[PDB]
Amino acid sequence: RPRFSFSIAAREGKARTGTIEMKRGVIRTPAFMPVGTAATVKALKPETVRATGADIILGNTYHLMLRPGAERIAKLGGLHSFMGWDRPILTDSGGYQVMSLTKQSEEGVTFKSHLDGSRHMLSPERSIEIQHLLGSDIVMAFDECTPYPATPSRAASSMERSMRWAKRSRDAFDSRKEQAENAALFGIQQGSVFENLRQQSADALAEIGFDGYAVGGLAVGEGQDEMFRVLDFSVPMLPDDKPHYLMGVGKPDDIVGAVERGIDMFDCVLPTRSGRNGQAFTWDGPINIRNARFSEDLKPLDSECHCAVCQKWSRAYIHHLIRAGEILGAMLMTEHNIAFYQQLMQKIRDSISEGRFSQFAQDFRARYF
Amino acid sequence: RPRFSFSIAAREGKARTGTIEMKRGVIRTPAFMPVGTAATVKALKPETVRATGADIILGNTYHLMLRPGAERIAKLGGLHSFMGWDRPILTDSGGYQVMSLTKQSEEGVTFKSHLDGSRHMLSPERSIEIQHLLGSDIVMAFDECTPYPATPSRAASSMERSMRWAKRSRDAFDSRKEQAENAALFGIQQGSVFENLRQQSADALAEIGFDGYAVGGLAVGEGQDEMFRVLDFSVPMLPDDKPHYLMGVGKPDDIVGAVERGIDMFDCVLPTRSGRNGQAFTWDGPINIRNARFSEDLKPLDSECHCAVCQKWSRAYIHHLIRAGEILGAMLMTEHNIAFYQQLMQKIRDSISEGRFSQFAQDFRARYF
Ligand SMILES: CN(C)CCSCc1cc(N)cc2c(=O)[nH]c(N)nc12
Ligand SMILES: CN(C)CCSCc1cc(N)cc2c(=O)[nH]c(N)nc12
Ligand SMILES: [Zn+2]
Ligand SMILES: [Zn+2]
């Protein structure tokens, strides 16, 4: 296959469905990327992740540069070989999380490990290098976190810095032969909720040129209405012939709405994180399996779900497992949830290909809520 | 198949290898039974347990009578259906653990739940009933725990009580039509380390008549030498044409030695428990994967092991996972360890069938240590 090739097969309104061809495999869009925090999709073997339908996973950079270490993973053969996943892997730049889980300057960010307190410097150049050492297929540009709420000037400065960092990410990426020829680079749009800033960011990104464009700075507490409002005018600013990636957005209803507004890629820990809290997704809305009303419920988590969990075990059993704090509980809940998400993406892709996505969205919401 | 049929195909010294035919399947002996504490073999799907080679698992009665509840499991269709394991399941009587994890009388034992402090009474009659409600294939007689060390009189009294309880277990079991016709009953020998008491217990048990005989009261802190000493004269006291079950014994070297002394069945949490502590079994002895020397070791846990874990992941990866406290770490370590144990039982069975077990034991110990 080629290094990177995105083609759109069908459209409906702002929605698109197509594929991204990469050396390690094909990615069907809109796509949902399970998240791999510590070089592992929480409680699942790679084969199980793949069995649910995932074509690509997100590698958690922040934790990996610390715990095992980028250099160590490279010595060991790279992330794909290390964890046993031979398909595409997208890695975030790490900077954002650092400014969450610090001394920030125009050159990067200095911080102390949340594990052993060690000091570390992370710059656009170092982020690209780390993602290269990890063997990432889709590399994210190193950007700066914009607090929410954010004033116009504060949002502008941070966005302007991110654009300067984007150019540096681009060059660092292109200066590394092996990486520029086998991996792809995604730029990240910033600008908070301000249209003029989003437009400036988009033009700067397009001027630099990337393989994909992400809408960053959202899902930071602005509520769905505001997020959708921002997506309405933000996504159209991005090049139409390249993938549109909404970072950190995963609630089913968020995904459906984001796709209606032109988003092609998603990632969220919610599926796996909710795979211990007791939250299981169903087409009739989410349920907390720990609730007493499920103690003797013999039905599967979801009446229609096709995943292996819904074929073999009952809510009553999973209920017991979660309340007993058993590992198998997390395993089954996580497999189901991730399978549910992939099934959601499949229905979205099919409905768009068949020109009935808008109706699907309406039917989905009516029942889900 | 029949309700219960044990036949010996080969022998060598006191060692035997054969099969136990039961309605839900065949059990190859000597056999190792993975332990299922809360209606789940820790961190493994039933299919994975079976894939490692296990023909039967041990259902943890104590925890089940409390957490989900015997009556509830029966209402839900029984343990096999509940957890997704359709093969034989052996259940302990619960009494022993109660006197561990209390008011004791000739009628049974009164205790407070280690979960919510609730009060509960457990008698021979109630234990048999609970195992019936769980749908157990091999039911253990309700016996009394004999402290260690134990004086002759204290050991005699407790043993005499256990024998009275064994008769009651037998009758309660036979009075329940469905259970007596589809399940088997195992009596448990007691008597601490005293030969005369072990002989009395054995004669009483044989007088009552059971489908199998367990050597209880061992592995309570007496050390391997003493345990083996007790097994030397204890096992021969048991009927030769019925299975000999050593409860709570699982270290590889213990198993090999016990088989040389006539034991056909084993169970131990060590395999799974050591599947979080970082202990992985190898033919060169156990290793603690958390040790720094494994951080960049690309070799599998064991150079010869045939399990799926050793085919796909490295020590370095499992090392990272365990130190990061990831669930997958426990999953992989547990699958390997249980697979290692089943491989051990296979080698023992084959070596006996081929009349070279004694040599295998010698070769095993030389390398393992
Ligand atoms: C723990 N995860 C849920 C979050 C990991 S960081 C992923 C992430 C999430 C969100 N909401 C916005 C952004 C953004 O604007 N830039 C970058 N680089 N990453 C982001
Ligand atoms: C937690 N497990 C390791 C132990 C569960 S109790 C199993 C168990 C273990 C041992 N060592 C001896 C005996 C015994 O003499 N009688 C009974 N009924 N059970 C026993
Ligand atoms: Zn499901
Ligand atoms: Zn192995």
mmCIF file with all atom_site columns, N, CA, C and O and ligand atoms in Angstrom, chain B residues 92-93 96-97 143 188 190 216-219 247-248 269, ligand 2:
data_model
loop_
_atom_site.group_PDB
_atom_site.id
_atom_site.type_symbol
_atom_site.label_atom_id
_atom_site.label_alt_id
_atom_site.label_comp_id
_atom_site.label_asym_id
_atom_site.label_entity_id
_atom_site.label_seq_id
_atom_site.pdbx_PDB_ins_code
_atom_site.Cartn_x
_atom_site.Cartn_y
_atom_site.Cartn_z
_atom_site.occupancy
_atom_site.B_iso_or_equiv
_atom_site.pdbx_formal_charge
_atom_site.auth_seq_id
_atom_site.auth_comp_id
_atom_site.auth_asym_id
_atom_site.auth_atom_id
_atom_site.pdbx_PDB_model_num
ATOM   1  N N   . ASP B 1 92  ? -15.364 -27.354 46.696 1.00 0.00 ? 92  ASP B N   1
ATOM   2  C CA  . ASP B 1 92  ? -14.941 -27.738 48.040 1.00 0.00 ? 92  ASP B CA  1
ATOM   3  C C   . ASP B 1 92  ? -16.178 -27.519 48.907 1.00 0.00 ? 92  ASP B C   1
ATOM   4  O O   . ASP B 1 92  ? -17.134 -26.883 48.468 1.00 0.00 ? 92  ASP B O   1
ATOM   5  N N   . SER B 1 93  ? -16.168 -28.037 50.130 1.00 0.00 ? 93  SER B N   1
ATOM   6  C CA  . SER B 1 93  ? -17.323 -27.920 51.016 1.00 0.00 ? 93  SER B CA  1
ATOM   7  C C   . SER B 1 93  ? -17.527 -26.583 51.736 1.00 0.00 ? 93  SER B C   1
ATOM   8  O O   . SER B 1 93  ? -18.571 -26.363 52.355 1.00 0.00 ? 93  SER B O   1
ATOM   9  N N   . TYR B 1 96  ? -13.838 -25.624 55.567 1.00 0.00 ? 96  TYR B N   1
ATOM   10 C CA  . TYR B 1 96  ? -12.424 -25.368 55.810 1.00 0.00 ? 96  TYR B CA  1
ATOM   11 C C   . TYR B 1 96  ? -12.082 -23.887 55.732 1.00 0.00 ? 96  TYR B C   1
ATOM   12 O O   . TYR B 1 96  ? -11.507 -23.330 56.667 1.00 0.00 ? 96  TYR B O   1
ATOM   13 N N   . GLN B 1 97  ? -12.428 -23.251 54.619 1.00 0.00 ? 97  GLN B N   1
ATOM   14 C CA  . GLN B 1 97  ? -12.154 -21.832 54.439 1.00 0.00 ? 97  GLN B CA  1
ATOM   15 C C   . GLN B 1 97  ? -12.799 -20.974 55.525 1.00 0.00 ? 97  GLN B C   1
ATOM   16 O O   . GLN B 1 97  ? -12.179 -20.033 56.022 1.00 0.00 ? 97  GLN B O   1
ATOM   17 N N   . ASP B 1 143 ? -15.951 -31.305 56.013 1.00 0.00 ? 143 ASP B N   1
ATOM   18 C CA  . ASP B 1 143 ? -15.011 -31.708 57.048 1.00 0.00 ? 143 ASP B CA  1
ATOM   19 C C   . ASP B 1 143 ? -14.619 -30.545 57.950 1.00 0.00 ? 143 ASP B C   1
ATOM   20 O O   . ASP B 1 143 ? -14.973 -29.394 57.683 1.00 0.00 ? 143 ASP B O   1
ATOM   21 N N   . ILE B 1 188 ? -13.029 -36.981 52.632 1.00 0.00 ? 188 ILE B N   1
ATOM   22 C CA  . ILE B 1 188 ? -11.726 -36.391 52.929 1.00 0.00 ? 188 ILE B CA  1
ATOM   23 C C   . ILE B 1 188 ? -11.064 -37.008 54.153 1.00 0.00 ? 188 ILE B C   1
ATOM   24 O O   . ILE B 1 188 ? -11.631 -37.007 55.247 1.00 0.00 ? 188 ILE B O   1
ATOM   25 N N   . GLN B 1 190 ? -8.510  -37.226 57.224 1.00 0.00 ? 190 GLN B N   1
ATOM   26 C CA  . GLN B 1 190 ? -7.904  -36.291 58.166 1.00 0.00 ? 190 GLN B CA  1
ATOM   27 C C   . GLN B 1 190 ? -7.022  -37.102 59.113 1.00 0.00 ? 190 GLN B C   1
ATOM   28 O O   . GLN B 1 190 ? -6.804  -38.296 58.896 1.00 0.00 ? 190 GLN B O   1
ATOM   29 N N   . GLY B 1 216 ? -6.744  -34.658 53.164 1.00 0.00 ? 216 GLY B N   1
ATOM   30 C CA  . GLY B 1 216 ? -6.859  -33.299 53.655 1.00 0.00 ? 216 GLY B CA  1
ATOM   31 C C   . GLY B 1 216 ? -5.915  -33.054 54.814 1.00 0.00 ? 216 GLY B C   1
ATOM   32 O O   . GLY B 1 216 ? -5.177  -33.957 55.225 1.00 0.00 ? 216 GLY B O   1
ATOM   33 N N   . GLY B 1 217 ? -5.925  -31.830 55.331 1.00 0.00 ? 217 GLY B N   1
ATOM   34 C CA  . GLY B 1 217 ? -5.078  -31.491 56.461 1.00 0.00 ? 217 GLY B CA  1
ATOM   35 C C   . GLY B 1 217 ? -3.596  -31.311 56.183 1.00 0.00 ? 217 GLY B C   1
ATOM   36 O O   . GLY B 1 217 ? -2.802  -31.185 57.120 1.00 0.00 ? 217 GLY B O   1
ATOM   37 N N   . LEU B 1 218 ? -3.203  -31.312 54.911 1.00 0.00 ? 218 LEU B N   1
ATOM   38 C CA  . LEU B 1 218 ? -1.798  -31.120 54.573 1.00 0.00 ? 218 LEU B CA  1
ATOM   39 C C   . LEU B 1 218 ? -1.601  -29.764 53.924 1.00 0.00 ? 218 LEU B C   1
ATOM   40 O O   . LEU B 1 218 ? -2.563  -29.043 53.676 1.00 0.00 ? 218 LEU B O   1
ATOM   41 N N   . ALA B 1 219 ? -0.350  -29.413 53.655 1.00 0.00 ? 219 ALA B N   1
ATOM   42 C CA  . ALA B 1 219 ? -0.049  -28.123 53.055 1.00 0.00 ? 219 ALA B CA  1
ATOM   43 C C   . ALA B 1 219 ? -0.566  -27.023 53.978 1.00 0.00 ? 219 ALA B C   1
ATOM   44 O O   . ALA B 1 219 ? -1.074  -26.003 53.521 1.00 0.00 ? 219 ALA B O   1
ATOM   45 N N   . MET B 1 247 ? -5.584  -31.896 48.306 1.00 0.00 ? 247 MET B N   1
ATOM   46 C CA  . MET B 1 247 ? -6.129  -30.544 48.317 1.00 0.00 ? 247 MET B CA  1
ATOM   47 C C   . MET B 1 247 ? -5.118  -29.445 48.649 1.00 0.00 ? 247 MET B C   1
ATOM   48 O O   . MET B 1 247 ? -4.253  -29.617 49.512 1.00 0.00 ? 247 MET B O   1
ATOM   49 N N   . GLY B 1 248 ? -5.240  -28.320 47.948 1.00 0.00 ? 248 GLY B N   1
ATOM   50 C CA  . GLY B 1 248 ? -4.376  -27.176 48.186 1.00 0.00 ? 248 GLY B CA  1
ATOM   51 C C   . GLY B 1 248 ? -2.888  -27.358 47.969 1.00 0.00 ? 248 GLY B C   1
ATOM   52 O O   . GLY B 1 248 ? -2.088  -26.710 48.638 1.00 0.00 ? 248 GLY B O   1
ATOM   53 N N   . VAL B 1 269 ? -4.172  -22.216 44.001 1.00 0.00 ? 269 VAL B N   1
ATOM   54 C CA  . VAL B 1 269 ? -4.404  -20.858 43.512 1.00 0.00 ? 269 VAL B CA  1
ATOM   55 C C   . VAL B 1 269 ? -3.080  -20.234 43.106 1.00 0.00 ? 269 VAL B C   1
ATOM   56 O O   . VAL B 1 269 ? -3.039  -19.239 42.384 1.00 0.00 ? 269 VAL B O   1
HETATM 57 C C1  . LIG C 2 .   ? -7.787  -20.914 49.321 1.00 0.00 ? 2   LIG C C1  1
HETATM 58 N N1  . LIG C 2 .   ? -7.432  -22.305 48.959 1.00 0.00 ? 2   LIG C N1  1
HETATM 59 C C2  . LIG C 2 .   ? -5.977  -22.409 48.729 1.00 0.00 ? 2   LIG C C2  1
HETATM 60 C C3  . LIG C 2 .   ? -7.852  -23.268 50.005 1.00 0.00 ? 2   LIG C C3  1
HETATM 61 C C4  . LIG C 2 .   ? -9.368  -23.513 49.958 1.00 0.00 ? 2   LIG C C4  1
HETATM 62 S S1  . LIG C 2 .   ? -9.873  -24.805 51.131 1.00 0.00 ? 2   LIG C S1  1
HETATM 63 C C5  . LIG C 2 .   ? -9.140  -26.189 50.210 1.00 0.00 ? 2   LIG C C5  1
HETATM 64 C C6  . LIG C 2 .   ? -8.335  -27.054 51.185 1.00 0.00 ? 2   LIG C C6  1
HETATM 65 C C7  . LIG C 2 .   ? -6.918  -26.906 51.242 1.00 0.00 ? 2   LIG C C7  1
HETATM 66 C C8  . LIG C 2 .   ? -6.141  -27.701 52.134 1.00 0.00 ? 2   LIG C C8  1
HETATM 67 N N2  . LIG C 2 .   ? -4.628  -27.519 52.173 1.00 0.00 ? 2   LIG C N2  1
HETATM 68 C C9  . LIG C 2 .   ? -6.767  -28.658 52.983 1.00 0.00 ? 2   LIG C C9  1
HETATM 69 C C10 . LIG C 2 .   ? -8.182  -28.812 52.932 1.00 0.00 ? 2   LIG C C10 1
HETATM 70 C C11 . LIG C 2 .   ? -8.976  -29.801 53.790 1.00 0.00 ? 2   LIG C C11 1
HETATM 71 O O1  . LIG C 2 .   ? -8.390  -30.529 54.581 1.00 0.00 ? 2   LIG C O1  1
HETATM 72 N N3  . LIG C 2 .   ? -10.304 -29.833 53.638 1.00 0.00 ? 2   LIG C N3  1
HETATM 73 C C12 . LIG C 2 .   ? -10.953 -29.044 52.778 1.00 0.00 ? 2   LIG C C12 1
HETATM 74 N N4  . LIG C 2 .   ? -12.246 -29.178 52.736 1.00 0.00 ? 2   LIG C N4  1
HETATM 75 N N5  . LIG C 2 .   ? -10.335 -28.192 52.025 1.00 0.00 ? 2   LIG C N5  1
HETATM 76 C C13 . LIG C 2 .   ? -8.976  -28.011 52.036 1.00 0.00 ? 2   LIG C C13 1
#
